[PDB]
Ligand binder design. Structure first.
Ligand code: UDP
Ligand code: MG
Length: 306
């Protein structure tokens, strides 16, 4: 009744079990918690979910077709009983303080809370986040409209007042930045009151692999093209609610062009170039307004590695 956790999962049965165990080690009264696991028509997860059910009130929904992370999260939102919903992607983990650290804010009058994010480069558990290898963390306060510029967190970091009660859902046409579109839909479409909670963190696993052993393929260009396209899509859909954020939006195509040129020249970008761009854009939104040529230079240093 108090909290529903929504875990969409697709051919990751091993990682799903790590995510579910991180729910089992929540410091929380399990009487007030329901877990909804949504299999997006991948390989079965009944055994994983059966195991977690020994300690949790878990429900498995089997999608009859692969609909995407948007479709699968909606499947969970439609059936969620909790006053508040907490998203968890099957390859991230909660810290034990995930709900004890956010629920006071939601009950006190927030509708939307996001916590710090540790971008973990090695696989960790819910009780072992501090053991993660971490080069960058997403800990941006909510005082400059960075969210109006571009996405600076991920669903696993979000606890929010029931989107079904608001009639607010994920857009199934978006396969990338669907979460950004959704957060803007709550914040601007439904006037959710957003609050940052820096005392709580999750682990979001971004394990490097082969790409930095090879070079930019024409698929890094294809994927960025779709990212760029959806970014323009959502920008048109949700106008910035401040003129400063509206001006800083114009830096993202500058950054995209820099990225394309690098890819085309066969030169890889920093593995965290997006997150280093967040830091540049967060500065461009505040304090004294830097010049546009200074910011264009910082984007350069951000995409290089420095
Ligand atoms: O067709 C898909 C692809 C992914 N997912 C789920 O959506 C979440 C986010 O997917 P992923 O981790 O690949 O997203 P990213 O971290 O790249 O945003 C995970 O729980 C996936 O299992 C899904 O339900 N259907
Ligand atoms: Mg993921």
């Amino acid at each position: 009744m108090l909290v529903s956790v929504i875990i969409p999962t697709y051919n990751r049965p091993e990682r799903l079990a790590v995510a579910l165990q991180s729910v089992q080690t929540l410091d929380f009264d399990s009487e007030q918690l329901e877990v909804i696991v949504v299999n997006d028509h991948g390989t079965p997860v009944d055994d994983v979910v059966e195991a977690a059910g020994r300690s949790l009130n878990v429900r498995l929904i089997d999608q009859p077709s692969q609909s995407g992370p948007s479709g699968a999260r909606n499947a969970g939102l439609e059936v969620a009983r909790g006053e508040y919903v907490a998203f968890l992607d099957d390859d991230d983990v909660f810290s034990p303080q995930h709900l004890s650290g956010t629920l006071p804010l939601l009950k006190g009058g927030a509708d939307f809370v996001y916590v710090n994010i540790n971008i973990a480069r090695t696989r960790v558990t819910g009780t072992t986040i501090a053991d993660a290898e971490v080069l960058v963390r997403l800990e941006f306060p909510y005082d400059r409209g960075l969210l109006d510029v571009t996405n600076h967190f991920a669903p696993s970091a979000v606890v929010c007042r029931s989107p079904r009660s608001a009639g607010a859902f994920f857009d199934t046409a978006l396969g990338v930045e669907e979460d950004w579109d959704f957060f803007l839909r709550l914040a601007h479409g439904h006037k959710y009151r957003v609050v940052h909670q820096p005392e709580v963190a999750i682990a979001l696993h971004r394990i490097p692999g082969v790409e930095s052993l090879t070079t930019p393929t024409s698929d890094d260009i294809a994927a960025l093209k779709v990212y760029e396209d959806n970014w323009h899509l959502i920008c048109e859909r949700w106008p910035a609610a401040t003129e400063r954020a509206e001006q800083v939006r114009r830096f993202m195509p500058v950054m995209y062009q820099m990225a394309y040129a690098s890819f085309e020249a066969g030169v890889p970008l920093d593995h965290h170039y997006y997150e280093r761009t967040l830091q540049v854009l967060y500065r461009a939104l505040g304090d004294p307004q830097p010049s546009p040529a200074q910011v264009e230079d910082e984007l350069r240093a951000a995409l290089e590695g420095r």
